[PDB]
Ligand binder design. Structure first.
Ligand SMILES: Nc1ncnc2c1ncn2[C@@H]1O[C@H](COP(=O)(O)CP(=O)(O)OP(=O)(O)O)[C@@H](O)[C@H]1O
Ligand SMILES: [Mg+2]
Length: 367
RNA sequence: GGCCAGGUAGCUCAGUUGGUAGAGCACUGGACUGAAAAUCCAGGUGUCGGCGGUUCGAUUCCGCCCCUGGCCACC
């Protein structure tokens, strides 16, 4: 309907940015970004009115958001900076060529891909490339972004882009960038499935040393990250109904050697979930004694008592130990599964003494 | 969109090792009154947001959503 409305208003609208990329990569997304030559607000209002849905205008931003079905539509007026601006002037202000393309929703040329900067070629060559030499200097956050994309899509940085990125980091612009945008970019990164590869890129270009104060790389943490990858793969394979957010575990491994103060402060800035904070605080202190107790575990009910109250994350962190692995597994796919029939339970019931008795019966069954 | 609280009677508010729920003022009924109010006895004051899952058993553990407030990211 957008093409028709644009025709009636004598305008030109374009699907723009990441949405295009994802499409060419065969990935379908529910968030669609439009750039309009002319007033975007009125186009959005008319689209919303014709579909009979609510509209959310932002006149100062010159953008409007509306939702149709599961589609989230964002309409933005073309602008030459973050006189009317051409679509090209709006595309050239973006980060990377693969993000810089556009698909025309205008009726005459409809479907046509618009690529000024050679983003389709870079998409075909698996290349991450900035539009201009000052790109990373303009928005240091992009330093992370590039890596993320390279991590996600298994692309590589251009020679020029790699040089410029390294130069940007060397200028210390990572410290000059707003803390919020960087932290948010990292939050975006840990949601990736290829997040470990991104972390590798982080290590290579040494961006973590700038963002997290006191943080340094070593081999133990790295190997712990890969072992964590193995465990995460296995758990997300067999136990997949029980899945949680995995990237946070990697993050905990990274800051594991950091001071509790800096760790707590970073997890504070990251706005981490409660179970992340709890798992961190448990890892920093009680995890050691817990492991030493698991070493002293003989009967299965002791393992039960020591494990069952814990969260999934703590167990996954416990699986990092070779000797404890098969034990944790045995607890998972065997030990904690059991039940009792009617008459028996009825005899067991004849307060908290019922619970204690049930515990006695369970430890009687196990051992 | 991410996260943090908050969700407890009509309203304003506490409650952790899961094990049979509470206060201050409205609610009914009767004793009391010519009627009413007060007061006494008392007792509703509640699937402790909604829906699934784990558990013998979930306000509690977890997952998906609703509502409100605040930190933000809103290229
Ligand atoms: N720092 C930046 N500099 C220039 N453009 C940026 C940018 N950050 C985001 N964008 C632009 O905004 C558009 C997409 O917006 P976003 O949704 O915020 C990032 P994305 O590429 O779609 O991946 P994402 O959906 O996982 O966040 C892209 O055209 C992209 O070039
Ligand atoms: Mg997006």
């Amino acid at each position: 309907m957008v093409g028709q409305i644009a025709k009636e208003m004598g305008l030109r609208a374009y699907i723009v940015g990441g949405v295009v990329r994802d499409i060419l990569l065969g990935k379908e997304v529910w968030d669609v970004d439009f750039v309009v030559e002319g007033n975007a607000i009125e186009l959005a209002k008319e689209l919303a009115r014709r579909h009979g849905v609510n509209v959310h205008p932002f006149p100062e931003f010159g953008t409007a958001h509306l939702k149709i079905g599961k589609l989230k539509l964002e309409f933005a007026t073309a602008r030459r900076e973050t006189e009317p601006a051409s679509l090209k002037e709006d595309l050239i202000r973006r980060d990377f060529t693969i993000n810089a393309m556009a698909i025309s929703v205008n009726l005459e040329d409809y479907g046509t891909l618009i690529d000024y900067f050679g983003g389709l070629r870079d998409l075909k060559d698996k290349v991450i490339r900035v539009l201009h030499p000052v790109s990373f200097i303009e928005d240091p956050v992009r330093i992370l972004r590039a890596l993320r994309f390279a991590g996600r899509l298994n692309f590589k940085l251009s020679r020029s882009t790699e040089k410029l990125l390294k130069q940007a980091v060397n200028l210390g612009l990572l410290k000059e960038a707003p803390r919020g945008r960087l932290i948010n970019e990292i939050k975006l990164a840990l949601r990736e499935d290829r997040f470990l590869e991104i972390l590798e890129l982080y290590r290579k270009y040494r961006v973590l040393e700038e963002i997290i104060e006191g943080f340094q790389w070593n081999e133990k943490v790295l190997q712990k990250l890969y072992a964590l990858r193995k465990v995460v793969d296995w758990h997300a394979l067999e136990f997949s109904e029980e899945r949680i957010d995995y990237g946070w575990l990697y993050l905990l491994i990274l800051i594991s050697n950091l001071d509790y103060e800096r760790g707590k402060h970073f997890l504070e800035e990251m706005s981490a979930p409660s179970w992340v904070r709890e798992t961190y605080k448990f890892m920093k202190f009680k995890l050691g004694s817990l492991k030493e107790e698991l070493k002293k575990a003989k009967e299965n009910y002791e393992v039960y008592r020591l494990l069952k109250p814990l969260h999934t994350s703590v167990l996954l962190l416990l699986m990092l130990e070779e000797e404890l692995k098969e034990k944790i597994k045995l607890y998972l796919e065997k030990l904690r599964k059991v039940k009792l029939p009617k008459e028996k339970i009825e005899e067991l019931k004849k307060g908290k003494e019922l619970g204690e008795r049930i515990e006695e019966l369970k430890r009687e069954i196990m051992n």
